[model samples]
Target: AKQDYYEILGVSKTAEEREIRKAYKRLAMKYHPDRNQGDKEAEAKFKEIKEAYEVLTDSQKRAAYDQYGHAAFEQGG
Candidate 1:
């Protein structure tokens, strides 16, 4: 099952764009490959954080996530 992006980011469903971006930045900087050298798990986590930020930052994706949850991306609609 797809993870809940909002829960992953520790933000409320009603979080604003600015709040989301801020959280993404904080997490990204911490888990970034450059900061976590030689750690495969950290690298993977960094990628996941980036993916969540990418989807949440976009208006359409955020709307889809909000209304349909993570399963939205799997649906034919």
Candidate 2:
């Protein structure tokens, strides 16, 4: 199954917007492709984390996400 965005971010419950960004940043720095150069693993992880962080930080999307988990997005547009 596709991992939900919250699970991708290693989160379950809610947090303040600032809290979410920090959490996102923490993992982002670790897995960011920039930090790891060409490591495929780091690049892959950063890919997912970036997706999760954006949705949670976006108040507009957050409104629907809480009600529907990963239903907020699919791989295709």
Candidate 3:
């Protein structure tokens, strides 16, 4: 099952870009591979967090995501 981007970042659907970045930095600090070495699940969550950060930070992509959830990017595949 896919996790919602907002939930991954622990922000609201209407959260601002600033809050999203703050959320990401906090989680990234906690889940970095070096900090959680040998924990596959922790590292996996880090990847998902990074992916969500990449999408939500871009204005165009964020708008697309808001409208279509994860399906917005799958169109390219």
Candidate 4:
């Protein structure tokens, strides 16, 4: 199973927009390919961070995610 978006970003369910952005920014920088230099694990982490950020940053998507969890996106809910 995939990890929860909140867990991926190390945030709480009640995290604010600023908090989410901060976590994403930190993780993105740490795992970014440019910095990781061909490390597959870092590359994967960066992708996961990007995906989670994309959803959590958008209000509509975030709302759906908050309501339905991962199924909000996985099953096209």
lDDT of each: 0.63, 0.61, 0.67, 0.66
Better of 2 and 3 by lDDT: 3
Residue 19, candidate 2: alpha-carbon lDDT: 55
Candidate 3's error at 67, in angstroms?
6.7
lDDT of 4 by residue, 1-77 (tens): 44677657877646656767888877677776676686747766755766565566666667776556534556544
Per-model clash counts, in order, read 0, 0, 0, 0
Candidate 1 residue spans exceeding 4 A from truth? 13-17, 63-77
Candidate 3 structure quality by residue, lDDT tens digits, 1-77:
55677668887646657867888878776776676686746777755666666666666667766556545556563
RMSD per prediction, one decimal? Answer: 3.6, 4.4, 3.5, 3.7
Model 1, position 46: C-alpha lDDT score: 50
Output the TM-score of candidate 3: 0.58
What's the lDDT for residue 38 in model 4? 67
Candidate order by TM-score, decreasing, is: 3, 4, 1, 2
TM-score of each: 0.57, 0.55, 0.58, 0.58
Best by lDDT: 3
Q: Choose 2 or 3, whichever is better by TM-score.
A: 3
Model 2, range 1-77, lDDT digits (tens) per residue?
45567656666435545755777777677776675776757766654666565566666556556555545564642
Of candidates 4 and 2, the better by TM-score = 4
